[PDB]
Amino acid sequence: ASVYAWNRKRISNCVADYSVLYNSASFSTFKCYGVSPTKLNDLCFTNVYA
Amino acid sequence: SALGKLQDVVNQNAQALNTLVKQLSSNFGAISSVLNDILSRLDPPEAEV
């Protein structure tokens, strides 16, 4: 969608892996705020968005 | 309420200890007040601050 009408996607009740995205070598920028690009496959979250 | 100064000293010591304990739940400008959570969420180079 556009920038002013971005689509929010709720993610819950699932197991999410993030190491396959950081090591994909396709994403230009992968800046993490509050968390680290690693040590995230060992944590569990309550409600994330996309 | 006969023994006043003794109870006052005991209450002052208890309040000092309670304040020293409760000063661990503060962030002081950090992300959180839990050192283990900080170490588990951020890598050392970013969690040093």
Curated annotation (Swiss-Prot), chain B:
Sections of the chain in a coiled coil: 7-49
Outcome recorded upon mutating residue 27 to K: In strain: Omicron/BA.1, Omicron/BA.2, Omicron/BA.2.12.1, Omicron/BA.2.75, Omicron/BA.4, Omicron/BA.5, Omicron/BQ.1.1, Omicron/XBB.1.5, Omicron/EG.5.1
Function field: Subunit of the fusion protein that is processed upon entry into the host cell. Mediates fusion of the virion and cellular membranes by functioning as a class I viral fusion protein. Contains a viral fusion peptide that is unmasked after S2 cleavage. This cleavage can occur at the cell membrane by host TMPRSS2 or during endocytosis by host CSTL. In either case, this triggers an extensive and irreversible conformational change that leads to fusion of the viral envelope with the cellular cytoplasmic membrane, releasing viral genomic RNA into the host cell cytoplasm.
Name of protein: Spike protein S2'
Lineage of producing organism: Viruses, Riboviria, Orthornavirae, Pisuviricota, Pisoniviricetes
Name of encoding gene: S
